[PDB]
Amino acid sequence: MSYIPGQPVTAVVQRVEIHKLRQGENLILGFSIGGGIDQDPSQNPFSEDKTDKGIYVTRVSEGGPAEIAGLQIGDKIMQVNGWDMTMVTHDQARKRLTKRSEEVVRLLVTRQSLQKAVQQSMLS
């Protein structure tokens, strides 16, 4: 899950924005997640990666809205719905993205090397 051929720390900050997936009364997030100063900070007393005390996605559902926006199962989220995730409790970020009122769901992610559907281009 962790390998940097020529991009240690210098990851690609991308934007995930998808319209909440309503279910009866609630909204479904097509990803699993833990990011928090709320979480266990005792594994990265300065940094662990681009994750640190930030928020970061632990999954994404195949075919769910998170994948449509481009979330990648293991990505360090820098923001949730306009909030700032660098040192914010898991629940702070989770509560925002589980607001059944956010017609659209905003996620700022730092995406490192979870390359999918990359198109080849032969330069000769």
From Swiss-Prot:
Changing residue 33 to T: Found in a patient with dilated cardiomyopathy and septo-optic dysplasia; uncertain significance. Ubiquitous. Detected in brain, heart, kidney, lung, small intestine and skeletal muscle. Detected in various cell lines including HeLa. Weakly expressed in peripheral blood leukocytes. InterPro entries: PDZ, PDZ_sf, Synaptic_Scaffolding_LAP-MAGUK, Tax1-binding_p3. May regulate a number of protein-protein interactions by competing for PDZ domain binding sites. Binds CTNNB1 and may thereby act as an inhibitor of the Wnt signaling pathway. Competes with LIN7A for KCNJ4 binding, and thereby promotes KCNJ4 internalization. May play a role in the Rho signaling pathway. May play a role in activation of CDC42 by the viral protein HPV16 E6. It is found in: Cytoplasm; Nucleus; Cell membrane. GO terms for biological process: negative regulation of cell population proliferation; negative regulation of protein localization to cell surface; negative regulation of Wnt signaling pathway; regulation of Cdc42 protein signal transduction; Rho protein signal transduction; Wnt signaling pathway. The gene is TAX1BP3. Keywords: Acetylation, Cell membrane, Cytoplasm, Membrane, Nucleus, Phosphoprotein, Wnt signaling pathway. One of its GO terms (cellular component) is extracellular exosome. PANTHER family: DISCS LARGE, PDZ DOMAIN-CONTAINING PROTEIN. This is Tax1-binding protein 3.
